[PDB]
Amino acid sequence: VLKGINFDRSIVTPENEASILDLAMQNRSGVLDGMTIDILNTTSNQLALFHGTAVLQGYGIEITRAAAPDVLVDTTGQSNETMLLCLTIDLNQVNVPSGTVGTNTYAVDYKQIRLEFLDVPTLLKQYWRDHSLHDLIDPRRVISMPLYWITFGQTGTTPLYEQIKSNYIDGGNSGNPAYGIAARCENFNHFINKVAVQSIPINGVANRPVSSTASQLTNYKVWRNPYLCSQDPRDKFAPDNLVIEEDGIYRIDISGSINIANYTFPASGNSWRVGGRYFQIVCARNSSANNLAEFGAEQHLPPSGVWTRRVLVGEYTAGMTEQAFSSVATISLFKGDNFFLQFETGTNTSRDSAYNNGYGTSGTHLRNFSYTLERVGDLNGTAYYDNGTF
Amino acid sequence: VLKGINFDRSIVTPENEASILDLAMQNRSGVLDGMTIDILNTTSNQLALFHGTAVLQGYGIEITRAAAPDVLVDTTGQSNETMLLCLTIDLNQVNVPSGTVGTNTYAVDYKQIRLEFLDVPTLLKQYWRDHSLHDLIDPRRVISMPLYWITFGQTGTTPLYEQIKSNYIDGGNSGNPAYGIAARCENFNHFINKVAVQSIPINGVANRPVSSTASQLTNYKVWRNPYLCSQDPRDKFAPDNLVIEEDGIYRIDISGSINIANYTFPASGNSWRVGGRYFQIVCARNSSANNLAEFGAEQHLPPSGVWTRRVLVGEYTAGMTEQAFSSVATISLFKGDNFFLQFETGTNTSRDSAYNNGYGTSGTHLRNFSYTLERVGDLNGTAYYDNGTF
Amino acid sequence: VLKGINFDRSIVTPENEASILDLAMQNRSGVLDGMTIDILNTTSNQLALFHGTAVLQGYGIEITRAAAPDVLVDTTGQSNETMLLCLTIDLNQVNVPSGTVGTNTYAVDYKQIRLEFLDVPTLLKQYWRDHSLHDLIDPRRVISMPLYWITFGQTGTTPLYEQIKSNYIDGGNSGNPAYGIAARCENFNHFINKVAVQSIPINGVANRPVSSTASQLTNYKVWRNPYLCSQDPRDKFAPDNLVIEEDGIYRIDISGSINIANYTFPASGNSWRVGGRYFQIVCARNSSANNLAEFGAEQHLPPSGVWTRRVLVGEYTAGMTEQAFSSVATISLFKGDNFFLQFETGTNTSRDSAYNNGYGTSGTHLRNFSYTLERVGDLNGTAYYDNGTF
Ligand SMILES: CC(=O)N[C@@H]1[C@@H](O)[C@H](O)[C@@H](CO)O[C@@H]1O
Ligand SMILES: CC(=O)N[C@@H]1[C@@H](O)[C@H](O)[C@@H](CO)O[C@@H]1O
Ligand SMILES: CC(=O)N[C@@H]1[C@@H](O)[C@H](O)[C@@H](CO)O[C@@H]1O
Ligand SMILES: CC(=O)N[C@@H]1[C@@H](O)[C@H](O)[C@@H](CO)O[C@H]1O
Ligand SMILES: CC(=O)N[C@@H]1[C@@H](O)[C@H](O)[C@@H](CO)O[C@H]1O
Ligand SMILES: CC(=O)N[C@@H]1[C@@H](O)[C@H](O)[C@@H](CO)O[C@H]1O
Ligand SMILES: [Zn+2]
Ligand SMILES: [Zn+2]
Numbered sequence A, B, C: 001v002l003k004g005i006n007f008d009r010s011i012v013t014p015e016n017e018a019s020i021l022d023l024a025m026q027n028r029s030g031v032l033d034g035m036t037i038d039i040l041n042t043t044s045n046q047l048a049l050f051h052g053t054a055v056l057q058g059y060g061i062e063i064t065r066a067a068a069p070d071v072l073v074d075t076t077g078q079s080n081e082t083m084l085l086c087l088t089i090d091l092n093q094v095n096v097p098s099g100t101v102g103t104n105t106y107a108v109d110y111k112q113i114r115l116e117f118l119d120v121p122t123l124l125k126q127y128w129r130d131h132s133l134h135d136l137i138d139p140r141r142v143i144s145m146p147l148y149w150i151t152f153g154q155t156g157t158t159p160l161y162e163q164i165k166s167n168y169i170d171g172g173n174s175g176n177p178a179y180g181i182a183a184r185c186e187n188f189n190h191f192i193n194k195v196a197v198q199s200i201p202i203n204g205v206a207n208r209p210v211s212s213t214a215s216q217l218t219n220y221k222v223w224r225n226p227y228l229c230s231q232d233p234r235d236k237f238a239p240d241n242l243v244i245e246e247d248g249i250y251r252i253d254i255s256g257s258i259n260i261a262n263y264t265f266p267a268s269g270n271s272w273r274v275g276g277r278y279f280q281i282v283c284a285r286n287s288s289a290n291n292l293a294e295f296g297a298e299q300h301l302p303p304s305g306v307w308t309r310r311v312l313v314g315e316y317t318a319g320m321t322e323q324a325f326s327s328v329a330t331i332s333l334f335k336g337d338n339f340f341l342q343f344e345t346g347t348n349t350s351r352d353s354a355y356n357n358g359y360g361t362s363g364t365h366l367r368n369f370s371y372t373l374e375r376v377g378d379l380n381g382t383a384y385y386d387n388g389t390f
């Protein structure tokens, strides 16, 4: 029959308002405030956390403050292991109320909520990002959110910790928690290597032209939303590749210029004309490597016929010292994918190459280059096949 | 007086939490999951639907599963007619509770909710997209959401069906249901016809240059959000025009290049100089044709002085074989409008035309062309006059 | 201990569902409908307002309609003063219920809600944009929203009024109230002054080339979201500068062309070659002037090392009459900042300048220029340092 949830005679239940809050959170779970480690109250038998608020699949969880320590987690028996400190909801448990709403003594022992240590495979099997209490096909009764990597040493020592920032709704994303900017950078200058195909380093280090003969590796300002993307964990690809953490339709914006651009000089033999040199800037996705996503999670497989390379800018050098470009595209990206940008040109400097024979500031380079990568759409349901291949 | 809705002494009512959920849905109604046709349980007297959840102006509606058929709709008396299967809320009806919250026997016969067949004019007069239960000026008591076009044949046959995808929040738009991408495509190549003004086909078929003498009509990947736009229903305009289904401020992104671009060759007579040829890429809106929107709904009239054409790219060919371009603009668009892109240049190939005299790959063409159209703002209230004219 | 807010045994309270609605409003407070001044029912002793709905930090407030006047505010004692008409929540007050939910006589005198006159410093000390009832560090019990500037004259006269549009969620922003477009314009043409550095007027008046010898100040269509930005209040900077009203990561899109672009003519002395002229289009932020934000509010100080200028387009003129450009960047902006766009080139017209020696349509100018400024991210928490410097 046709059931009303929110109507005059309806009883509005707890799964109901939690389903509403989840919708209001754009189906994102995470710590809204606090819940960071309290090292001062952390011993070799206990792990302390500060007060705060989290939302886990629409269920509001609070660590209350008083007097500190705001909360204590038992670390007895944990040694020489890397574990995940998790906030878990277990709907098989019973919340025990006591006292009364008549006197001012009503309290609940929320046994459905736990702060616990899990290993990586156990967390993954019940991770909120892959499984749901509200799921249609495979509904779960137990769901977790990892807060910290906790590395326990020998018996009698305090452990080492690393915050799981993808699970904290810290800042930059309030209002649109599941979307917004994935990555962005300030303008940078990057020397073009004398090769046909090369990646443009988008992870905060560029090969900056500094003199007429030299370039040097130089940091530039970059930001990444850890919920959406991360720098590649393999050092070979760390300067260039992002790992996508969340499926979706993403917008890629690029702008900059090609400085000291090569071209065939106008001479009597070519009827005093500039001989343009072809170049292209491409964005690329690659999913050949599995388990690149956070916790080594299984990648989300793309639909059959998915794109791998897309031309953002494709043209010839125009005979000017510096030529600007700009491009905006929407592209599908999948959890576990690598994403990168490439500069492509010919290798014959006297015939087809956009680059010259110089080095540093005397050599062809990208100048004032910047990008923004933003999540603008999801790939749930039918969108996976209809929108996911490009 | 000043009334509190959510305060300590307030009674939080059913219209209240439904007004809250509607706000949380960005004022969009639609099926959240399931509610698709069940052909196996569909006869000549009954129409079956699978279980699911919908939100209609903040009211949560559920079709419950058990044992199937999840729900049955009486089709007796319906023959040789095209009807709309609708989910309707009727606040004039009474929801009948039975049993008690003390025993575990509390139930409700939700007479305020109906699954019914309506003709197009009846649905339009009570369509959620144009009328509201929460409306300020004209509050309604009955509101509907169309789910399927149902075409009944002769008495004794099962009917034909077509899903109304604009009313299903399927995928791509979760989190931002009333906004996001309206249309997008992968890069395509399109031959420039030897005319002053022509539309660029944005609907999935381009005239692709394939040889030195020929081009051929070729499909390219395209996606449209049916809630925001649709391909023009008239075959004359189907390759080029979109029909806007929702008022708003939209962002249009375009990028690509003009390949085999024409220019006056540098000769002794012109002092060995390239004679550039002017071209422009424009986006256009046209509202002369009424009833192009879904169901033949009345178009939303634009404010006095509304734009019709906007230059995205306006420049000269630079003497290169291929020249890239990019542009981003925000534009106002109205339900019922046609939206299209045009390429504009002179017609004299030896004087003012950006195109040459060649055909296929030897002729001037758009290369690596793509676009994204996205809804970024609404046109409610004062914005209609202040933001709606451009 | 671990407390559940939304669980089976939880009591869902009034601060709770107000915290939920605030989250659903993207932490924006404002009038959702009505609440505009009623001049017909306004005397020298009373100020009338029409019915409507507002949300103040998740608390729903309603002015009920009946018979009008929908509400009356006592103006006795107010004279020769500019005041702010404010809607205030005071949690120190007691809401007085009467009657019963058994009979149909339950009513509340909401003493926690006031419509009052405050001076600018008092409103600022309890303004919802800077302080919160739900605040972590400094929780408040009293919070206000300014609705109108009210200027009272001599005793016996009706006052003058000006709506505070930043506090009305009127239109353009429903669905994403705290984000969306900040400013946008239609295409305009603007004469380039014969100077090294100049601002591009983004506030609705351009110096339009009209003849071969003259340009004239001409209005063009522009829109600003008053919640996000405003035209500079100082006349010296009014044609060019925006004042940012809300911290965040903003997206700036620009497009247009440089028409009648200057270049060194190809002659036998330069081997029949175009001598390109460097130019750049930059966006800029400046926070040297305090109190530019609405009500003269204190500016939000940017993190150490914040950017001030960013190149959007940097290249040489290519020897064409008209050359197009486009650029998209994300930038951090702070409440109280000035934001503007600049055109930068050399001043020697025979050597390094992108501009020529002509005037009006015979002189170098921006053609088909437009922009969109959009709020795309916040700068709360860690994002302030990680994302706020660029
Ligand atoms: C299995 C493996 O290491 N594959 C890598 C892939 O991860 C990476 O994205 C790509 C970059 O060009 O190179 C290889 O394909
Ligand atoms: C009444 C009618 O058919 N008008 C059409 C309009 O629908 C369409 O948008 C336009 C395309 O250029 O051509 C005409 O104006
Ligand atoms: C204190 C003062 O008036 N400073 C102004 C600043 O407000 C403005 O943004 C800038 C524009 O270039 O000029 C000055 O710096
Ligand atoms: C041919 C090519 O693209 N080579 C890239 C190189 O530019 C990049 O620096 C390196 C690390 O990402 O990976 C290679 O695959
Ligand atoms: C002069 C002009 O713009 N002609 C267009 C044509 O390019 C387009 O293919 C056709 C169908 O959309 O409609 C015409 O109006
Ligand atoms: C050198 C420079 O940038 N001058 C600008 C000028 O172009 C602008 O018209 C005026 C008002 O905004 O402010 C000046 O600072
Ligand atoms: Zn649910
Ligand atoms: Zn996953």
Ligand SMILES: [Zn+2]
Binding pocket: A376, B376, C376
């Ligand atoms: Zn956006």
Ligand SMILES: [Zn+2]
Binding pocket: B015, B019, B134
């Ligand atoms: Zn309502």
Ligand SMILES: [Zn+2]
Binding pocket: B129, B130, B297, B298, B300, B335
């Ligand atoms: Zn309509």
Ligand SMILES: [Zn+2]
Binding pocket: C015, C019, C134
């Ligand atoms: Zn709160």
Ligand SMILES: [Zn+2]
Binding pocket: C129, C130, C297, C298, C300, C335
């Ligand atoms: Zn402030």
